[PDB]
Amino acid sequence: DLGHIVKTIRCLEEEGHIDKSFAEDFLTWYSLRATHREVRVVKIFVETFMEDLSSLGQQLVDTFSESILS
Amino acid sequence: DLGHIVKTIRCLEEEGHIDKSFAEDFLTWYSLRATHREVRVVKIFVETFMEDLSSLGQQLVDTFSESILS
């Protein structure tokens, strides 16, 4: 979870939807003072995103592999 | 574009949908020998992903900001 949340927050930050400031605050909050249910809800959001990432990856691989190999 | 493609490929790699090997090959291919149309199609896939990232970011911010602030 924590590893997935950090990786996900990094993706967001790298494209400027959150500033480094919010990233830090989000992670400190998540780790220290997020209630058990708000963690469960964070996990849900991250899981949807993981599914979208899985899909893109499959798409890129499926669509371009043949070309990449030459 | 290129900056967005690299950032996007990094997100994928960080969660093991592609190995560092494919990342490198994908980027070299994209830059050097991807045809103009296959670039247009890559861009489309990346754009869908950018929309999914935008949404997650908004979701996290919208849902948790109040909590993060205390």
Author numbering:
A (entry chain A), B (entry chain A): 532 to 601
Passage from the reporting paper:
The Arabidopsis VEL proteins are accessory proteins that interact with PRC2 to nucleate and propagate silencing at the FLOWERING LOCUS C (FLC) locus, enabling early flowering in spring. The VEL domain adopts a compact globular fold, consisting of four α-helices in a quasi-antiparallel “up-down-up-down” configuration, each of which contributes to the hydrophobic core, as illustrated by VEL1VEL.
We thus identified RR>AD, a double mutant that remains predominantly monomeric up to high concentration. As for VEL1VEL, VIN3VEL floaters are exclusively observed with the WT domain, whereas RR>AD remains soluble without a tag up to high concentration (2.4 mM). VIN3VEL crystals also show protofilaments; however, these are invariably composed of dimers rather than monomers as in VEL1VEL. Indeed, dimers are seen in every single crystal, regardless of the mutant, space groups, or crystallization conditions. To form filaments, individual VIN3VEL dimers either stack perpendicularly on top of each other in a “cruciform” fashion (in RR>AD) or they associate pairwise to form tetramers that, in turn, stack pairwise along the polymerization axis (in I575D). Our combined results from NMR and crystallography suggest that VIN3VEL can switch between two conformations, with H4 tucked under when monomeric or extended as in the domain-swapped dimer subunits of the protofilaments seen in the crystals.
